[PDB]
Design a binder for these strands. Structure first.
Ligand SMILES: [Ca+2]
Ligand SMILES: [Ca+2]
Length: 461
RNA sequence: AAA
């Protein structure tokens, strides 16, 4: 059992417990291929190793080996053949691949190669190489493999910064991980910009990196400093590196600024390079949604003639793009929610209902997204289905998710409005009386609350 | 990646 025990000591994709959902594998592979072709990084060993791991998980071990050989080939060709400790991730993945394929003598050869380097570098472990480069590689693998992995990814980069606070690579990984984690909390009450100072430092230490600049710009926009952020957008757009990536995030920036035409132009250019990107399709859909809203507000909700044809174009284009996003990544929960909401605008309540029903079964990494699912379904039930019974059920389910948020507040307010409406038709509706007491209780008005609960108890005679 |  010596071989397997040794393999478990290696630091590589096989031992990093990457959270990779089978339903997210097609999208992951597309994003890995996009990164190989279009993300300009100093080293590409990591991303080829991840492609090899993906091929392995697909049952394509020979294809996996080709990606590991490419990782080794690129290590020397683009860095003057110098020896680099990142190669140990590749060698670890070779050892595992050959173990799985039954090429056990070769597996041992790669273990021996790793051991030889750990000894040369006075590493304390025989196979587990302790160096910041491999902490970074572990972090980048985690960061690519889905939101479930992001606290772990951030901790990989943090471990490096605790020793070397001006390390450019881990500064960047820490900032990106922190930015995405801030995004998970962006609608929670009293959320804070933990990623802002990390992003400033990452830009300082990586001055040619336009990817980091556009994230800094977006966080500045979040924090009400749009003008400062736009300066970073312009710097990034002046650099040719990583364009689909600079363009996707700059397009978000411009959309949120209100320059929707500019956003769409950037996104359509990005789509030429990465047509499978679910982020691009979702962002394009959001641009059409914004233009739909613009048309409605200019025609006070009653477009006719060409304006109506334009509105329908926006609705059907947003549906097309949100459908494209969820076909490619069926676990993309918020794209389903935008899609359901757009089917309401198209007047297709059955397809809205279908997508809400799918959403109600999902288990999002961001648990608070279920508040929005219940809230918007409750509104659909109230306003499109004319079902107060089901609206109440789902407003209550949103409220039962206790985390304080924009949507939980809206759910309390929507329930209050619905119940007040029902009481104006029937002042002695016992259920509505107690629900109004519940609402007042959640708001803090304990005397008004108990009045209504009491009143409701009285009624039960 | 909605918000
Ligand atoms: Ca390039
Ligand atoms: Ca290739």
């Amino acid at each position: 059992h010596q071989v397997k025990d040794s393999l478990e000591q290696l630091r590589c994709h096989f031992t990093w417990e990457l959270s990779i959902d089978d339903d997210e594998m097609p999208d992951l592979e597309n994003r890995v291929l996009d990164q190989i072709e279009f993300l300009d990084t100093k080293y590409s060993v990591g991303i080829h190793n991840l492609l090899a791991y993906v091929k392995h998980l697909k049952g394509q071990n020979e294809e996996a080996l080709k990606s590991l050989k490419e990782a080794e080939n690129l290590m020397q060709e683009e860095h003057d053949n110098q020896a680099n400790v990142r190669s140990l991730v590749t060698w670890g993945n070779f050892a595992w691949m050959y173990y799985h394929m039954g090429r056990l003598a070769e597996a041992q050869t790669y273990l021996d190669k790793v051991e030889n380097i750990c000894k040369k570098l006075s590493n304390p472990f025989r196979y587990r190489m302790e160096c910041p480069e491999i902490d970074c590689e572990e972090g980048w693998a985690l960061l690519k493999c889905g939101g479930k992995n992001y606290e772990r990814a951030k901790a990989c980069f943090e471990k490096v910064l605790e020793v070397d606070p001006e390390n450019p690579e881990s500064s960047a990984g820490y900032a990106i991980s922190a930015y995405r984690l801030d995004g998970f909390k962006l609608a929670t009450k009293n959320h804070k910009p933990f990623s802002l100072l990390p992003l400033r430092q990452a830009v300082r230490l990586n001055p040619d990196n336009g990817y980091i600049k556009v994230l800094l710009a977006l966080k500045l926009q979040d924090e009400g400093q749009e003008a400062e952020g736009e300066k970073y957008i312009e710097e990034a757009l002046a650099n040719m590196s990583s364009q689909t990536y600079v363009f996707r995030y700059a397009a978000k920036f411009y959309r949120r600024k209100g320059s929707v035409d500019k956003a769409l132009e950037l996104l359509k250019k990005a789509l030429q390079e990465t047509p499978t990107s679910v982020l691009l399709h979702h962002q394009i859909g959001l641009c059409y949604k914004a233009q739909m809203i613009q048309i409605k507000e200019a025609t006070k909700g009653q477009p006719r003639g060409q304006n109506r044809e334009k509105l329908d174009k926006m609705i059907r284009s947003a549906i097309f793009h949100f459908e494209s996003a969820v076909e490619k990544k069926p676990t993309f929960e918020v794209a389903h929610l935008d899609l359901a909401r757009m089917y309401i605008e198209a007047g297709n309540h059955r397809k809205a209902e279908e997508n809400f029903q799918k959403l109600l079964c999902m288990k999002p990494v961001v648990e608070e997204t279920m508040q929005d699912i219940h809230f918007h379904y409750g509104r659909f039930q109230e306003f499109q289905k004319k079902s107060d019974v089901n609206a109440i059920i789902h407003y209550l389910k949103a409220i039962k998710i206790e985390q304080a948020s924009l949507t939980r507040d809206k759910s309390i307010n929507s329930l209050k409005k619905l119940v007040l409406r029902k009481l104006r038709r029937k002042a002695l509706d016992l259920e509505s009386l107690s629900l109004l007491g519940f609402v007042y209780k959640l708001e803090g008005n304990m005397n008004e609350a108990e009045e209504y609960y009491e009143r409701a108890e009285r009624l039960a005679a």
